[PDB]
From a paper:
Bacteria encode a variety of reverse transcriptases (RTs) that evolved from mobile group II intron RTs to perform different cellular functions. Here, we determined a 2.6-Å crystal structure of a full-length [name] RT apoenzyme and a 2.8-Å cocrystal structure of [name] RT bound in an active conformation to a snapback DNA synthesis substrate and incoming dNTP.
The structure was solved at 2.60-Å resolution in space group P21 by de novo phasing using selenomethionine. The thumb domain of [name] RT is similar to that of GII RT in being composed of three parallel α-helices (α1-3), but differs in extending straight up for 41 Å, 15 Å farther than in GII RT, and ending with additional short α-helices (α4 and α5) that interact with the thumb domain of the opposite monomer. RT2a is nearly identical to that in the GII RT cocrystal structure, but with a hinge region (G116 to D120) that connects to RT2 and is disordered in the absence of bound substrate. By contrast, RT3a in [name] RT differs markedly from that in group II intron RTs in forming a novel structural feature, a double-helical plug (denoted RT3a plug; highlighted in purple in Fig. 1 C and E). The structure of the RT3a plug and its binding in the active-site pocket of [name] RT are stabilized by an interaction network that includes salt bridges formed by two conserved arginine residues (R190 and R191) that are located within the 9-aa insertion and form part of the first α-helix of the RT3a plug.
Author numbering:
A (entry chain B): 2 to 64, 81 to 117, 122 to 411
B (entry chain A): 1 to 64, 79 to 115, 121 to 411
């Protein structure tokens, strides 16, 4: 079919590889950034192998993140469907569905609270990607595709990757992306579309009767004028989720899995603490960031003593390299939260960074005092020409 | 369309061509050359397809302060080289010439073997204005029977007219500022230049390697090795007669002391950026002087950035204390890796002492600047961004 030939064309496949590349570089993990580089090292034959297998309708190549051949096929399947299929173009353009962004949902949440949304319930659909009915998804997609090859490809994308997105795998994504939920949408490009197809009825039913429901994949936020309205909304949501064999964490019985109460006091949403007036990274996100920085400064502190005594020190953690990589870690994290207006927590984080940097600077000075020139070279991270020749 | 020209236009050979062009850009120290390759990489799908498409249409306008050839021109030249050397008998033959270079380290290795077997004297010269005085029609004349494909032949001619024939003495001096061994820059900036030189000087290579005279040539730099000063003088005059046959010449060391060398091999001589002596191979004095000047430039930029980042809040960050020590470290890595075939340890130690000394000056200047400074100045000076500046 024209639909399947569009997925097999190297134009859309190569076009999908760039999106997979960006989603990887937006992550802190070096292994994910280097995995894209090796696939890139075979760029001509590596994507033609995918194209050839799709033409033969052989999907065995799909077997914390999905493999790049799997990740590219998912991205290539999405772009074609959203510009060729009316339903896919429709569910991805849902006003209350975000993912195909976090800043938009939080901006909409903030706007609602500024305009009467004084109470909220924020919950999650537990075990969403494992409890969703694979056969209902294919059922809802079959007439809109009219291509059993594309349907089987979508079916194999779910079986190999999407249905395996469990809570253990999601926790691995949180330590990789600054806003953890953005990892699912980018390690599995079909997950936003998969959730939008399965919860399209849920979205339509929940945005009514003065209740706003903002949803990002399987995380949703109910906003209302009174506590009674959001309480009625949550029970209405449990029934809608129950129609398709799903549930949601009750904030009244699972205090740590869901939130409930006034919006004026603030609540966590998509990795940020959202008040009607203040938007900042959540306490859990900042704790994760301070722990990431501590590990780099600890590694830099050990390398000061190692490079002063030994000549096989890894330059990656030398003084120049460590300060260089910590700078990039700060750049990547701050850029992910440029939509936030909380200046106090950023300055508090800056004081934490400057404090540990002062500890490292003072430690370097004490070690390099009365040291010889070659020791200063290994500690600061500037190679000796004689070592390269030896 | 012939199978030879379809091979050049295939994206597979165009991809292996650009991967080498990308690699050669990183082997250069110039940040502009490394970032120019990234801009062509920013359009990776359509950038190489535009070339593939225009080649199939035989439209070569895309080949048109720039020291290297443009990346589309550089890619096509590399693709033309890869296809020719594995398909044409002459091209694989002239590239596999024993006395033609097989990197610089092999030419220097062959020079040591000649000295090891009796070459007590030498003459090292250059063919001046080689690429501008090269005859376009003689090149096509030597290639036309071995190709049998006018499409590939006209593409070779347009590569010469747009890039190779414009490699003049002013542009070569720009290549020395970029690569540790300056003559390697010609091969990296214009991939077809070694093949073009080997095709043009094939008769010269055959005539010179005779009568007990070893002739080692790298593009347009050549070295004559013989048992006596009389032998290499006879050989140099034989080289002038051969170069005069094709409207070329070579610098006479007897009249141009600074353009060519002549004398005993035991006292040492400069060849391909290296000083070659009986047992000591090391970077030449000009190569070491050019390297110290590059390090001086980075430390000057690092020194000025300490003063700038301490006074102003729009610092580049590229030359901050951590970033400067980082790039200088890599500059030292790239320069040292290029002379791993050398065995002269005293000059590597002398350069290390030079590096350690400039590093001590910079560390002392940073200490005086950061003394009695606040935390925000130390952040800009050391090269650790502020989270509050990103959010603003």
């Amino acid at each position: 079919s024209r639909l399947y030939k569009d997925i097999c064309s190297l134009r859309t496949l190569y076009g999908a590889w760039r999106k997979v590349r960006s989603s990887a570089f937006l992550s802190s993990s070096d292994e994910i950034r280097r995995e894209a580089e090796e696939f890139e090292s075979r760029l001509p034959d590596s994507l033609i192998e995918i194209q050839h297998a799709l033409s033969k309708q052989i999907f065995i190549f799909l077997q914390v993140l999905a493999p790049i051949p799997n990740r590219v096929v998912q991205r290539a399947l999405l772009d074609v469907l959203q510009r060729r299929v009316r339903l896919v173009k429709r569910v991805l353009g849902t006003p209350t569905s975000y993912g195909g962004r976090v800043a938009m949902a939080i901006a909409d949440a903030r706007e609602a609270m500024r305009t009467g949304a004084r109470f909220h319930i924020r919950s999650d659909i537990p075990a969403f990607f494992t409890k969703i009915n694979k056969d209902r998804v294919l059922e809802l997609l079959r007439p809109h595709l009219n291509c059993e090859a594309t349907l089987k490809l979508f079916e194999e994308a779910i079986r190999t990757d999407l249905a395996n997105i469990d809570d253990l795998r999601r926790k691995g994504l949180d330590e990789i992306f600054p806003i953890g939920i953005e990892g699912v949408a980018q390690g599995s490009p079909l997950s936003p579309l998969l959730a939008n197809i399965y919860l399209a009825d849920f979205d339509l039913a929940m945005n009514s009767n003065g209740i706003t429901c903002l949803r990002y994949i399987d995380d949703f936020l109910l906003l209302g004028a009174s506590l009674s309205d959001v309480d009625k909304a949550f029970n209405r949501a449990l029934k809608e989720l129950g129609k398709i064999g799903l549930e949601a964490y009750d904030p009244r019985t699972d205090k740590t899995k869901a939130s409930r109460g006034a919006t004026e006091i603030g609540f966590d949403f998509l990795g940020c603490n959202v008040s009607p007036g203040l938007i900042q990274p959540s306490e859990a996100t900042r704790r994760r960031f301070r722990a990431k920085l501590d590990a780099e400064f600890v590694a830099a502190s050990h390398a000061l003593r190692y490079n002063a005594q030994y000549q096989d020190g890894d330059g990656k953690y030398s003084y120049s390299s460590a300060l260089y990589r910590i700078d990039k870690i700060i750049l990547g994290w701050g850029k992910a939260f440029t939509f936030c207006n909380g200046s106090q927590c950023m300055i508090a984080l800056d004081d934490f960074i400057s404090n540990k940097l002062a500890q490292l600077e003072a430690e370097k000075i004490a070690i390099l005092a009365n040291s010889d020139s070659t020791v200063r070279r290994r500690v600061l991270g500037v190679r000796l020409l004689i070592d390269i020749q030896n």
